[PDB]
Amino acid sequence: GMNRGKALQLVKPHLTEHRYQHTIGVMETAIDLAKLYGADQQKAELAAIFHDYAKFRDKNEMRTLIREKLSQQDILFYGDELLHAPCGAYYVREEVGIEDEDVLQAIRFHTTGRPNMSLLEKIIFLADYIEPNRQFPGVEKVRTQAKTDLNGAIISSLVNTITFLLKKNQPIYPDTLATYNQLLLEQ
Amino acid sequence: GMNRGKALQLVKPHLTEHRYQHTIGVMETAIDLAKLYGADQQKAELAAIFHDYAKFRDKNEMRTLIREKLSQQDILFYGDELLHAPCGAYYVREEVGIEDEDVLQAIRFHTTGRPNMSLLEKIIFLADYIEPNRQFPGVEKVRTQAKTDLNGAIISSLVNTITFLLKKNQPIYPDTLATYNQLLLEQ
Ligand SMILES: Nc1nc2c(ncn2[C@H]2C[C@H](O)[C@@H](COP(=O)(O)OP(=O)(O)O)O2)c(=O)[nH]1
Ligand SMILES: [Fe+3]
Ligand SMILES: [Fe+3]
Ligand SMILES: [Fe+3]
Ligand SMILES: [Fe+3]
User: What is the rounded distance in angstroms from the CA atom of residue A127 to the CA atom of residue A32?
Assistant: First the structure.
């Protein structure tokens, strides 16, 4: 890892003020969930600070990176918002020197999720959704649910996200539904 | 193929009045969609009459048939409603002697859909959803859409289906989402 203040200082120039504020919220929320569920709070903190590092990077450069250097090529068919998580994990490793594989994995899957996520991945996934600045409808219920049921809170978040994409007639990454089904079948 | 009268004589004994009205509704809607989109109206009629042949068959026998005789085993993880289409396609061939592969596929995929459905599969899938006795919320828009945009009506139906399943926290068959995505991405 690395110093919190330096980390925040490094990410901020890559974010709008609104997104920087979001990042602080995710950080605070990730730490709290890390405490509550026995996750490493420092890895949670760091993954939270850099989760949106690539949010505003050039989309053509990011699609090229996926094609030329990264693993899951199918993401290219399912929406430009799917770029930043995987590309960010790559860029933070290459541009900042974060090599903590746990931290990078949590960044990598924070947008789509994946079946059988690690605790740290789940914490960042959910923190992103329920951080205090978010105003998606029904968030309060998910926040409350998060206090006692991490997986259930994640299921609830996925329902809201997938519902929204359907209403907007946008494509839905198949591994996001696989996450919903996996967690649901886990009960 | 078998004519309407004979086909109906074979399904009627296991149809309540509501189910009989469903059959006729699907049958007439399918014919109209066939007329509209240049599909075979006799195959549309026949597939419609038999689409729900296995609806009220023994669910344990059906699960066993999926296990012993059929290809897709994963269907058994996503709800009892997914049994009757593939098993019905099987039973109609074996018991009724219908070997028309176009008719049988239309029966097989009418509940879940698949990416890259034939026109006849699309007509039966959609006819089931928009037949006049169906009262699901938003149906009227879907019926209007169907008069001009078959793929769009099917997208709208999937949106309402998947949305409902998400809201009730039910497992969603992945190939149903693949269907949505395929039709969406093609337009
Ligand atoms: N196509 C598709 N889009 C998705 C999926 N999951 C999330 N999204 C989209 C919906 C939102 O517009 C966007 C939000 O991105 P995020 O990484 O979760 O949050 P943020 O980066 O906006 O803070 O991601 C998904 O599974 N498929
Ligand atoms: Fe993000
Ligand atoms: Fe975020
Ligand atoms: Fe059916
Ligand atoms: Fe039916």
Answer: 9
C-alpha distances (whole Å) from A80 to each of A96, B80, B137 are 24, 36, 31
Annotated binding residue at B127? no
User: Considering the domain A1-187 in this protein, what is its CATH number?
Assistant: 1.10.3210.10
- Whether B172 has a binding-site annotation, put simply, is yes
Q: How far is the CA of A29 from the centre of ligand 1 (A)?
A: 19
> Do the beta carbons of residue A85 and residue A114 sit within 8 Å?
no
Q: Using CA positions, which residue lies closest to atom 12 of ligand 1?
A: A81
Q: Do B169 and A159 touch (CB under 8 A)?
A: yes
Per-residue burial over B60-78, b if 16 or more Cβ lie within 10 Å, else e, is eebeebbeeeeeeeebeeb
Cβ partners under 8 Å of residue A32, min gap 6: none
Domain map (residue ranges) of chain B:
1-187
